[PDB]
């Protein structure tokens, strides 16, 4: 099975550096190309360069001076490495292998990397409960949840019960706050009668500043 | 560089039906293009090559057409799943460009939304400041509106709100607005109430709750 995994997601100041590293297995980097390509929020792809199977080099015409891509074929890894990044470079950045070797035609996907360029500074979530109660039992449904609050740059992952509820589980948008720092909330619905016997855990990871929670959420009263 | 024009911006439409995604190239590109579906927070996922090619798994209802500038993705007899944005890549000129995508968006019955009211914790409040929180979940359409009362006074400017993207299952969306307010003008507060609106309710609904009880 073809796979392509990137390092995580994180901040870069303005004028610094981006690097990222995309670890392929299922296939060899001497036999085939690696791409970079990326997505700006609400935005379209933006091929950005590649790496060929020889060890030849493409850039699009916009980073040609300040992109390199090189990589080490005995780890099947791939690094990306641009310079004086801007806020205009806030993006997911993905790698990706095509169908045949020399071609265009992206069938493989790593699963992107969110880099935020802010001069802000990294800050981990605080994670408090969204508890049901009397007034939460919607025909004998409840909804819990968990709000993660006050954390930069952004992405944060939320699963619940480590994966085994997903069924009712919605995880919203978050949303940037005056204060500069995001919150988002994750809620589930479960029926009331289960709040009693069975336990509600929302697994939280904001990986820019390793921060993971696990955290209960139980009816109050 | 070669431009994608992709139409329409967002297309809506309902189960069943064959629907037809543009994609217009600023020159001639031959059948040079690559379709692509991303779902939310997904990677891109490959549909077909070169114009019309099928890819290894997927489903036999996406299709392609077109030669020299204008393209077509079809999807004959939609499902609530195909929900996504979908987007064409052309590699006929160097560098290969993308268009900025079209959003597919599936009609469905008006739903009204279930609600809940979430008190802030007593955690949060240690922390000198309190969020509310106002769940509208699974409704359809994507209108709704959250009106925030303490006291029954009009709350104006202190809250955020933010919408799940279509629920690929039954096409419903639910909705999130946190209110947010000073431990201080929390604790002067009795009634905390959540009032919404929507073309599926034939009046308000209200959830509340009373600060300590």
């Known amino acids: 099975q073809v796979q392509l995994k990137q390092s995580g997601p994180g901040l870069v100041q303005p004028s610094q550096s981006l690097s990222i590293t995309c670890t392929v297995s299922g296939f060899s980097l001497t036999n085939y190309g690696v791409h970079w390509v990326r997505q700006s929020p609400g935005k379209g792809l933006e091929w950005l360069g590649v790496?060929?199977?020889?060890?030849?080099?493409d850039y699009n015409t916009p980073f040609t001076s300040r992109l390199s891509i090189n990589k080490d074929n005995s780890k099947s890894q791939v690094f990306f490495k641009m310079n004086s990044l801007q806020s205009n470079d806030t993006a997911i950045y993905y790698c990706a292998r095509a169908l045949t070797y020399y071609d265009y035609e992206f069938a493989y996907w790593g699963q992107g990397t969110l880099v935020t360029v802010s001069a802000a500074s990294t800050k981990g979530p605080s994670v408090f409960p969204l508890a049901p109660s009397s007034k939460s039992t919607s025909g004998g449904t409840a909804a819990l949840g968990c709000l993660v609050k006050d954390y930069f740059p952004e992405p944060v992952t939320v699963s619940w019960n480590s994966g085994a509820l997903t069924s009712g589980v919605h995880t919203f948008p978050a949303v940037l706050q005056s204060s500069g720092l995001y919150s988002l909330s994750s809620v589930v619905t479960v029926p009331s009668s289960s709040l009693g016997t069975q336990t509600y855990i929302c697994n939280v990871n904001h990986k820019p500043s390793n921060t993971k929670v696990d955290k209960r959420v139980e009816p109050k009263s | 560089d070669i431009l994608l024009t992709q139409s329409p911006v967002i297309l809506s439409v309902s189960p069943g039906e064959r629907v037809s995604f543009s994609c217009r190239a600023s020159?001639?590109?031959?059948?040079?293009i690559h379709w692509y579906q991303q779902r939310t927070n997904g990677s891109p996922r490959l549909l077909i090559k070169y114009a019309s090619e099928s890819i290894s798994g997927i489903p036999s209802r996406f299709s392609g057409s077109g030669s020299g500038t204008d393209f077509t993705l079809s999807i004959n007899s939609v499902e609530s799943e195909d929900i996504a944005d979908y987007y064409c890549?052309?590699?006929?000129?160097?560098?290969?460009?993308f268009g900025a995508g079209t959003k597919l968006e599936l009609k469905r019955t008006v739903a009204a939304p279930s609600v809940f009211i979430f008190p802030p914790s007593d955690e949060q409040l240690k922390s000198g400041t309190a969020s509310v929180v106002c769940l509208l979940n699974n409704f359809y359409p994507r209108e709704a509106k959250v009106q925030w009362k303490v006291d029954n006074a009009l709350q104006s400017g202190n809250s955020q709100e933010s919408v799940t993207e279509q629920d690929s299952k039954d096409s419903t969306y639910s909705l999130s607005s946190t209110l947010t307010l000073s431990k201080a003008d929390y604790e002067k507060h009795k009634v905390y109430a959540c009032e919404v609106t929507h073309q599926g309710l034939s009046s308000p609904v209200t959830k509340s709750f009373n600060r300590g009880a």
């Open positions: 790496i060929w199977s020889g060890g030849n080099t």
């Open positions: 020159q001639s590109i031959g059948t040079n």
């Open positions: 890549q052309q590699n006929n000129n160097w560098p290969t460009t």
